[PDB]
Design a protein around this ligand. Structure first.
Ligand SMILES: *[C@@H](C)[C@H]1/C(=C/c2[nH]c(/C=C3N=C(/C=C4\NC(=O)C(CC)=C4C)C(C)=C\3CCC(=O)O)c(CCC(=O)O)c2C)NC(=O)[C@@H]1C
Ligand SMILES: *[C@H](C)[C@H]1/C(=C/c2[nH]c(/C=C3N=C(/C=C4\NC(=O)C(CC)=C4C)C(C)=C\3CCC(=O)O)c(CCC(=O)O)c2C)NC(=O)[C@@H]1C
Ligand SMILES: *[C@H](C)[C@H]1/C(=C/c2[nH]c(/C=C3N=C(/C=C4\NC(=O)C(CC)=C4C)C(C)=C\3CCC(=O)O)c(CCC(=O)O)c2C)NC(=O)[C@@H]1C
Ligand SMILES: *[C@H](C)[C@H]1/C(=C/c2[nH]c(/C=C3N=C(/C=C4\NC(=O)C(CC)=C4C)C(C)=C\3CCC(=O)O)c(CCC(=O)O)c2C)NC(=O)[C@@H]1C
Ligand SMILES: *[C@H](C)[C@H]1/C(=C/c2[nH]c(/C=C3N=C(/C=C4\NC(=O)C(CC)=C4C)C(C)=C\3CCC(=O)O)c(CCC(=O)O)c2C)NC(=O)[C@@H]1C
Ligand SMILES: *[C@H](C)[C@H]1/C(=C/c2[nH]c(/C=C3N=C(/C=C4\NC(=O)C(CC)=C4C)C(C)=C\3CCC(=O)O)c(CCC(=O)O)c2C)NC(=O)[C@@H]1C
Ligand SMILES: *[C@H](C)[C@H]1/C(=C/c2[nH]c(/C=C3N=C(/C=C4\NC(=O)C(CC)=C4C)C(C)=C\3CCC(=O)O)c(CCC(=O)O)c2C)NC(=O)[C@@H]1C
Ligand SMILES: CC1=C(/C=C/C(C)=C/C=C/C(C)=C/C=C/C=C(C)/C=C/C=C(C)/C=C/C2=C(C)C(=O)CCC2(C)C)C(C)(C)CCC1=O
Lengths: 160, 67, 178, 54, 161, 296, 160, 131, 161, 161, 161
């Protein structure tokens, strides 16, 4: 998380955490209540968030489910929903932790090798995470929308 | 293998080295095409100035036969 | 750590110094004098290029690494992990830093082979910050990070071809992700 | 005199989070819109101007 | 490299006097612009690969450059051009964060113009590609940050010119 | 034929801005059932929400003005922004505009418009062809649209069309409620500010009641804009102290706090026995459709 | 050309060409007639084989030309036809060279980055080059099938 | 009161009566199995809350020891097989304002199966103002 | 390392003798293998990613191995095991075309068991990974070539197991 | 490395579940402790040199190690011990601020035992110096911050022991 | 091995401190739980022979494990499997009587993981079998006693995990 990031950055220079790092951790720990509440909100709408996220994705890129696509039947669409819930959980992990590194530790390192060995169009995965961001921001406060959109946007960028 | 020759001046920004340093401060060296991007990125990140660069070996625009 | 010599090719005018630096680079990269390992010196072109000062000592070291002899000696008869250990010992002067470095170098050795590994490990920022553009690489005695010193000591305390075991196969992760 | 006739099949292993079985019905809940078979043959396309040129 | 604060500090230090009213006014201006710069940086970090994609598409694809005999021909040179534009976009974003053109001068323009001349790269074509970068990033970040990002991209083009 | 799509593009070329826009809109209407379906995810629409949000937030008359400026390739910032996009981006933008019009988020077509004969022939030609060269024709038609500095021109500009009845409530004939709900459809909020007392008690849906006449005026000026209301029926009862409680149900043909063109909306009125309007409560009755949910 | 590869290896070893290399170029030069015959046959029947393999690729992967795919739109399918033409010409170049260097350096090195930028499903291109392989084997002689299939297999494996 | 069946006129279904009894008993964890997985709650002066644990949260930090007194109700069919039940009662506990004298309206959109896909808590207001 | 041809060469040379009849006939046997081995190598190289892809899809994919807690979880370890299977397939092909397993135990078996134990990799799961690789190769190389693929991959498993 | 905030994340993700009430409560507990953790880390960083000086004074100075022939002799070696104690203190501060002692065994304890064995370092002497540092810091940072710092330093010592 | 009482005594002895309020509260908690633990022990020793029957029937019967090729085929393997389940049940009952996990650390989990690995027996299937015996024992011993049994069984699984 942000504490882990600060510790690693300080370890790189072989020094104690600077006052900037210390009061950044200060602000993060003080404001963690809002982050935990937003993680709770994202967790609660998990089934629906995945539901209309996948619906909008398929309406936007039906080729992934069309004849020739990676996920033709309800079985492979279910696998897409499974991966979709995976990356929703990853974004929740990032929100609670406050830093993107756990996402990198979980669902961003070697992802291109994953979705090349599987034939999945990674651009479609990015679009699905973008549908995450759009609908989730629709179902939450604007400032909280931006707070979650930071991690959704980072996942989108690592996609493309 | 489409070689470059680069004349670069890399100064010292942190340490005052007490021995002779023109051998690595202002140098004209040979760098391959494949290594050139990494070499120039390293040189720029080290604060040096690329005084000059040229394709000493190779022909520009060679679609085939670049070994 | 103190009873050693560092070969800096300060000037190419002194041909004797250039030859001494070339021989020291051969010894460091290949761990031995390459008299009984070659029909004839195949690095004569690199020696001439360095003697004319058209390339730096770092380029000479990279050319030594990107040579058929090195892949015959320290790449062909060992797995990728042992190749990583031997390469980081010969050029960077120390054992692998961590599992991140091992993962990266395994990625290069799996995607682009040994030449890309040598080029990345030679053109890296650590190589330039340690040996510069004129110093032949030498054995290092790092204090950090953790376990780097013991791994380097084990790597350098055994003669060439002493054993086939892996001094640093991989760092056991304290915390396993997922 | 009820008797428990235990069947051949092993007891069905409890569904876990990783398995997409719990999402399977959701997929049928989705019922994603598929796509019709594209009726193009590529024989009548001539590659001199049919390819983009901008 | 330098940023707005470092640039102001160096400008004050070269004649060796303290930060006067003008210097702190410039510092206030940069601090005010920092919010917009961070937001635009987030957007560009979102859509860098896209912006490169439609930039090359509206500037390079299906043109005299990509066709056989052009410098962008062949998958190797295409990948090289894609990486060039990716690095240009990333460094323009870096300069936008810093508010200073020093990073472009000492990290993007030293050794690049004559590198292209040695390779025979079309300078007039890369200029239009960077201008496509400008327009695409303006369409996303908005006009307010778009103008400053275009300023940095124009600096890159002028140095390359 | 091989030249089906180039000939169709040439046919589209001579059609004027009015014919071109009408053909595009009617092709979108025929989309899915007769023409090719739309998959906007294929094009990078993430660089286009700026113009779409700008057009949505902008008012209906000048919405149509900006759209027709694009159609005749006027020199406006929106026109240049459209012209700086790739053909897939342009087509996705047009499809998003069509979806907004279908959902009513943007000003729709003139009521009861019929496609021209030439445009009808070109659209039928589009319908006959395969999906691939249909999408090709649409792309080549939309790429040239927009202002690009260079050699381009238009023959005749397509000017925006320069262009209200009393609402009937079943079971209710109160003059005050009729004036309120007619003026809002006519956007006559200034009449309403004198049409109710200074209490200013309004109940936005899924919100707390607003208090204060100035707050009510801000809500009317900020929230309510070009709202189209069609009351279906209503009932009036005597509340406490002679107050009139009027529950009137209808529909709103315009996006309104996440509301569709067809939505069962209800109004509860506490009107003063001697005054006019003491409290108004607007509630969007639920159904098997919920896109305005925010969870918590 | 294998001559260039052998020269490169010998120069790397700083030695004259070994008997194996000499025999390699000798067999290559003595058998150049068959390679030229393959090149001429591919050039003559390029237009039909490319169209047939593209049709079979469509039959395997209709989603590529579905409304929302990279090949959708007659422009975007003519561009597939042109890409298949380019790869067939590259294979013809390689057949007359004896090695895969021109294939590697004209359309193979950095192909993944280009097809990621354009969004093309590289696995679909692998299936397309496979179909090119079956079409060429059908139109071309049995013994030369091994030689042509070796290069097609190399292109498929590297670009898969 | 709480132990006895809630006296509601026009409502004769076990689901609504069980929901009344559970809400009075405050066993919200036992209360919410009557809810649908996609089911939502429409709080007064707030937009609908969707997600099962979201309704759990709304119960366990908002609906904290409140007493509701239903009076009457009506039921009719709804599209997609849903059943629209409009129940009116009075709230005898402080719940978002209007102590004792607020008419709460519950709009139960029941699933054809029986679970409540959507329930809305409508706090009908008396002539009392400043709420 | 060494293969069958180098095996006969150094077997003759350790005794300091020429090619006796036994070496003559084993060279005849290896030459008779000949075109079959090289054809199998080419067919393996053709769909090189395909063998590993369907091998993962058959045994490892969609199981507790690839689920949370399993060593397959996260994209990093998925790509790592894909790289491991690529090593295994390439080295099996090298041993096949050479005809000897010296390359495997000089480039794979040395420390691979201990290096997986350091990472706590499932030896058994890798075992059926190479097992599935066996029939995925056999379905594309035939029976006898598939048989020798099975033999060498079984040697790899035994060294690993 | 792992901290108190990501420890819950990994614990929940090994079974693949989301963050439930227990994880939420653990995160809130860590955030509550964050105030004291940050204050202790800042105070320790301000006084690291004095802390190591005082710990060396009351645990190593004027003993057999510092006398000639001892491992503290040869002032380079004394500076090596000063550096080692600084490392131990800084990494203990890292672990205390993180809330989990995973960085200690990943960046400090990894390979330390055979390091000291090869160098012939007195392991118990270093352990005693670590408890001296623990006592010095506990008397300067308070009772609870000293509690956590002593916990992590004792974890380091137990790794050493 | 130490129970809760002896564990508390040893913990107090480590600090050289008397039994403070926490000591007596933990002791009284164990004494209160003693009634439940004894009755659950009687109930579980009641059906220790039969309970493992349905524990394995719903876990490891008519599956890949029992069939030939599986690691539970052959009378020795099935007998060792049922005996391992009996060992786990008996030792978890021992821990429940003692109310401490100390016995499992040294007498059950000590050397069990690598023992299974060398044996090649499926550790994951053992995990599911121990879970199944968890529900089976919870069915007979009750809810609270069931939870106490289940915590120890989950500890065994985690150690074997
Ligand atoms: C007075 C003339 C100066 C002075 C000296 C001073 N030194 C100490 C303590 C120590 N001095 C050493 C030095 C060495 N140890 C070595 O191994 C080497 C040679 C290889 C040297 C030079 C050490 C290790 C100590 C501390 C440990 C020990 O004494 O055994 C003191 C006392 C410090 C204290 O607080 O006890 C003093 C006074 N100090 C000055 O200010 C003068 C410049
Ligand atoms: C000082 C009175 C004047 C002055 C000097 C100045 N020099 C530098 C930097 C360098 N000087 C050298 C020169 C040498 N290095 C050698 O090894 C030898 C031969 C044995 C010589 C002659 C070099 C190589 C550098 C750059 C590398 C380095 O710093 O080691 C500076 C600093 C420049 C900077 O900021 O980078 C200065 C100031 N400048 C004046 O104004 C004086 C008249
Ligand atoms: C067809 C089955 C697949 C497919 C193809 C496709 N390609 C493009 C565009 C281009 N293709 C290339 C390729 C090359 N140029 C070269 O020089 C070489 C070697 C000689 C190759 C392989 C290039 C450079 C382009 C860019 C356009 C241009 O050439 O100017 C497209 C268009 C994509 C777009 O967004 O316009 C398509 C559709 N796409 C698929 O989905 C199939 C798998
Ligand atoms: C794309 C917009 C244009 C284009 C690109 C192109 N570039 C090369 C080769 C190189 N480009 C670079 C670039 C950089 N080095 C740096 O340090 C910086 C700072 C980020 C940059 C931008 C380098 C170093 C090279 C050579 C090394 C390498 O390519 O790896 C090529 C290839 C040229 C050739 O193969 O001969 C191409 C095609 N080409 C165009 O036409 C566009 C205008
Ligand atoms: C869906 C809209 C897109 C898509 C996805 C897709 N994925 C799979 C299969 C798998 N996905 C994963 C990914 C992960 N597992 C992990 O543990 C992690 C981190 C937590 C990741 C990222 C894996 C491992 C699989 C393999 C099966 C398994 O989960 O065990 C499929 C099905 C592939 C198949 O052929 O079975 C699909 C369809 N594909 C698209 O085209 C969409 C854009
Ligand atoms: C895959 C078949 C199974 C699997 C394995 C797995 N491996 C790793 C990590 C590594 N595996 C290797 C492999 C090798 N090293 C060698 O020297 C050789 C011979 C060339 C081989 C095959 C290496 C080097 C690593 C570490 C470096 C890296 O990551 O590239 C992991 C990840 C371990 C971790 O996260 O620490 C895994 C999971 N997992 C399965 O599920 C398969 C049954
Ligand atoms: C049953 C759930 C699983 C299973 C069991 C199985 N175990 C063995 C062999 C052994 N089991 C043990 C374990 C213990 N012995 C002890 O004294 C204790 C202390 C508490 C334990 C935990 C040991 C030591 C062995 C080896 C010696 C023996 O033969 O018993 C086998 C047979 C192994 C073999 O090679 O014969 C089996 C089959 N197998 C499964 O598949 C189940 C998941
Ligand atoms: C499938 C697919 C896609 C393509 C998708 C496609 C095909 C997208 C295209 C969708 C289309 C064809 C949308 C049409 C939009 C037309 C509008 C909004 C015009 C309205 C005109 C009006 C209101 C004028 C009214 C009027 C006024 C006011 C007057 O003044 C009087 C008259 C008049 C009528 C003129 C993508 C590109 C997204 C991805 C790839 C891919 O394969």
């Amino acid at each position: 998380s942000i504490v882990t990031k600060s510790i690693v950055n300080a370890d790189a220079e072989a020094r104690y955490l600077s006052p900037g790092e210390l009061d950044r951790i200060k602000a993060f720990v003080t404001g963690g209540a809002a982050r935990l509440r937003i993680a709770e909100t994202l967790t609660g709408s998990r089934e629906t968030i995945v539901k209309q996220a996948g619906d909008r994705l398929f309406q936007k890129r039906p080729d992934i489910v069309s004849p020739g696509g990676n996920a033709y039947g309800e079985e492979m669409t279910a696998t897409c929903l499974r991966d979709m819930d995976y990356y929703l959980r990853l974004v929740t992990y990032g929100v609670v932790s406050g830093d993107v590194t756990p996402i990198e530790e979980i669902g961003l390192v070697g992802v291109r090798e994953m979705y090349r060995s599987l034939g999945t169009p990674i651009e479609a995965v990015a679009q699905s995470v973008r549908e995450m961001k759009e609908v989730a921001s629709g179902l939450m406060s604007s400032d909280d929308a931006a707070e979650a959109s930071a991690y959704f946007d980072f996942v989108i960028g690592k996609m493309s | 293998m489409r070689m470059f020759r680069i004349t670069a001046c890399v100064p010292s920004q942190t340490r005052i080295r007490t021995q002779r340093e023109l051998q690595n401060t202002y140098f004209t060296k040979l760098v391959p095409y494949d290594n050139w991007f990494r070499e120039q990125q390293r040189i720029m990140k080290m604060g040096g100035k690329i005084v000059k660069v040229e394709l000493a070996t190779g022909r520009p625009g060679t679609n085939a036969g670049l070994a | 750590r103190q009873q050693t010599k560092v070969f800096k090719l300060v000037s190419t005018y002194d041909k004797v110094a250039v030859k001494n630096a070339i021989r020291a680079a051969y010894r460091q990269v290949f761990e031995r004098d390459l008299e009984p390992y070659i029909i004839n010196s195949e690095f004569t072109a690199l020696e001439s290029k360095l003697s004319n000062n058209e390339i730096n000592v770092k380029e000479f070291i990279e050319g030594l690494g990107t040579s058929e002899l090195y892949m015959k000696e320290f790449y062909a008869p060992y797995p990728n992990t042992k190749v990583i250990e031997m390469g980081t010992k010969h050029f960077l002067g120390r054992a692998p830093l961590n599992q991140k470095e091992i993962q990266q170098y395994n990625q290069i050795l799996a995607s682009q082979g040994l030449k890309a590994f040598i080029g990345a490990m030679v053109n890296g920022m650590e190589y330039l910050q340690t040996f510069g553009e004129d110093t032949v690489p030498y054995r290092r005695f790092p204090t950090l990070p953790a376990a780097n010193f013991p791994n380097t000591e084990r790597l350098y305390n055994k003669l060439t071809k002493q054993d086939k075991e892996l001094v640093v196969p991989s760092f056991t992760p304290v915390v396993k992700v997922g | 005199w009820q008797n428990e006739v235990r069947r051949f099949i092993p007891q069905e292993k409890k569904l876990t989070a990783g398995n997409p079985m719990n999402f399977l019905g959701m997929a049928r809940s989705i019922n994603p819109a598929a796509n019709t078979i594209p009726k193009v043959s590529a024989q009548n396309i001539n590659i001199e101007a049919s390819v983009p040129r901008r | 490299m330098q940023d707005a604060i470092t640039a102001v500090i160096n400008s004050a230090d070269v004649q060796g006097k303290y930060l006067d009213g003008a210097a702190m006014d410039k510092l206030k201006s940069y601090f005010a612009s920092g919010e917009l710069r961070v937001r635009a940086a987030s957007v560009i970090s979102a859509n860098a690969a896209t912006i490169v994609k439609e930039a090359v598409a509206k500037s390079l694809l299906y043109s005299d450059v990509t066709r056989p005999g052009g410098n962008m021909y062949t998958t190797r040179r295409y990948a090289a051009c894609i990486r060039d534009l990716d690095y240009y976009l990333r460094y323009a974003t870096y300069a936008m964060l810093a508010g200073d053109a020093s990073i472009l001068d000492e990290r993007v323009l030293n050794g690049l113009k004559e590198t292209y001349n040695s390779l025979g790269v079309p300078i007039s074509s890369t200029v239009q590609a960077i201008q496509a970068i400008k327009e695409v990033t303006a369409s996303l970040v908005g006009a307010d940050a778009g103008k400053e990002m275009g300023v940095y991209l124009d600096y890159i083009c002028s140095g390359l010119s | 034929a091989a030249d089906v799509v180039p000939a169709t593009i040439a046919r589209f070329s001579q059609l004027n801005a009015e014919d071109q826009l009408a053909l595009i809109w009617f092709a979108y209407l025929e989309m899915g059932k007769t023409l090719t379906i739309a998959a906007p995810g294929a094009a990078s629409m993430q660089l286009a929400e700026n113009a779409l949000k700008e057009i949505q937030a902008m008012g209906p008359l000048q919405q149509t003005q900006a759209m027709c400026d694009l159609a005749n390739r006027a020199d406006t910032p929106l026109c240049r922004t459209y012209a700086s996009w790739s053909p897939n981006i342009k087509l996705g933008f047009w499809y998003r505009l069509g979806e907004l019009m279908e959902q009513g988020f943007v000003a729709p077509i003139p009521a009861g418009y019929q496609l021209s004969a030439n445009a009808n022939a070109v659209l039928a030609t589009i319908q006959g062809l395969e999906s691939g060269q249909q999408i090709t024709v649409l792309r080549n038609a939309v790429v040239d649209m927009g202002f690009t500095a260079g050699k381009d021109g238009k023959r005749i500009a397509e000017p925006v069309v320069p262009p209200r009845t009393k609402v009937s409530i079943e079971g209710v004939t109160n003059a005050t409620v009729l004036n309120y709900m007619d003026n809002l459809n006519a956007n006559d909020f200034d009449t309403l500010i004198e049409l109710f007392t200074s209490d200013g008690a309004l109940q936005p849906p899924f919100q707390r009641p607003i208090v204060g006449k100035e707050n009510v005026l801000r809500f009317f000026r900020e929230e309510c804009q070009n709202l189209k209301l069609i009351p279906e029926r209503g009932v009036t009862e005597p509340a406490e102290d002679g107050f009139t409680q009027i529950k009137v149900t209808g529909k709103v043909q315009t996006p309104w706090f996440g509301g569709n063109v067809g939505m069962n909306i209800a109004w509860r009125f506490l009107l003063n026995p001697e005054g006019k309007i003491f409290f108004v409560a607007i509630d969007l009755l639920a159904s098997p459709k919920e896109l305005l949910n925010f969870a918590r």
